[PDB]
């Protein structure tokens, strides 16, 4: 029972690039030369092995069910921008959506220290 | 932490 955002719906999906941006191999060979299906950006088509993206199996499953943005394409799920502090945009460890600290509810001013999950994923 | 900047560092850059 994973929640999808209205603005993530009915949007164009770029043609997936069948190669990992990190290890430069296909779904048939990850870094260990083992099979691993790719995760692909719906904006630009950029793909990566979950292993290359350092995704946990749990995060991998949830991301595959969502409209995912690659590391470069990721916009704030609140304000829909990258902005001045795009490098500091938080990534949810549950769904990998992006959130500026000031766009979080409630707002943050300092970086959380361990695992962080967004307002959408928080119980 | 885990931000966009750290994601770049952690995975080794994109191509
Ligand atoms: Zn890879
Ligand atoms: Zn992308
Ligand atoms: Zn924002
Ligand atoms: Zn989340």
Author numbering:
A (entry chain A): 190 to 312
B (entry chain C): 1 to 15
Please quote the authors directly:
The developmental regulator monocytic leukaemia zinc finger protein (MOZ) also known as (MYST3/KAT6A) is a MYST (Moz, Ybf, Sas, TIP60) family acetyltransferase that is required for self-renewal and differentiation of haematopoietic stem cells. The structure of MOZ DPF shows the typical globular domain of a DPF with PHD1 and PHD2 each harbouring two zinc atoms coordinated by C4-H-C3 motifs in cross-brace topology.
To investigate the impact of H3K14ac on the helical structure of the H3 tail, we crystallized a MOZ DPF–H3K14ac complex. However, the interface area (844.6 Å2) is increased in comparison with the DPF-H3 structure (695 Å2), revealing the molecular basis for H3K14ac recognition by MOZ. Importantly, a conformational change mediated through H3G12-G13 allows the acetylated H3K14 side chain, now devoid of charge, to insert into a preformed pocket on the DPF surface. This pocket (lined by S210, F211, N235, L242, W257, C259 and I260) is mainly hydrophobic and exhibits a weak positive electrostatic potential, rendering it unfavourable for unmodified K14 interaction. The acetyl group of H3K14ac forms a hydrogen bond with the main chain amine of I260, revealing that I260 makes contacts with both H3K14ac and H3K4. While H3A15 engages in a hydrophobic contact with L213, residues C-terminal to this are not visible in the electron density, indicating that they are not involved in interactions with the DPF domain. While MOZ-DPF showed enhanced binding to the H3K14ac peptide as compared with unmodified H3 tail, this enhanced interaction was not observed using the GG12/13AA peptide, which bound the DPF to a similar level as unmodified H3. This result highlights the importance of the GG hinge to enable engagement of the H3K14Ac by MOZ.
